[PDB]
Amino acid sequence: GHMVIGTWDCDTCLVQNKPEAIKCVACETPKP
């Protein structure tokens, strides 16, 4: 919640996620 921006938005389920993750947090999609 602090200087952690960079979240990526999905393109299949339409859901944002943290850049520290490996996949989506809604559809479980493989991060690019």
Kindly identify the residues of this chain, within the stretch 1-32, that bind Zn ion according to CB under 5 A. 10, 13, 15, 24, 26-27, 29
User: Is there a contact between 16 and 24 (Cβ–Cβ < 8 Å)?
Assistant: no
Q: Is 27 annotated as a binding residue?
A: yes
Task: Answer yes or no: are the C-beta atoms of 22 and 32 closer than 8 Å.
Answer: no
Between 13 and 21, name the residue whose CB sits nearer to Zn ion: 13
C-beta atoms surrounding 15 within 10 Å: 15
How many residues line the site for Zn ion (CB under 5 A)?
7
Residues 6+ apart with CB under 8 A from 28: none
Q: Indicate the annotated binding residues for Zn(2+).
A: 10, 13, 24, 27
Binding region for Zn ion (CB under 5 A): 10, 13, 15, 24, 26-27, 29
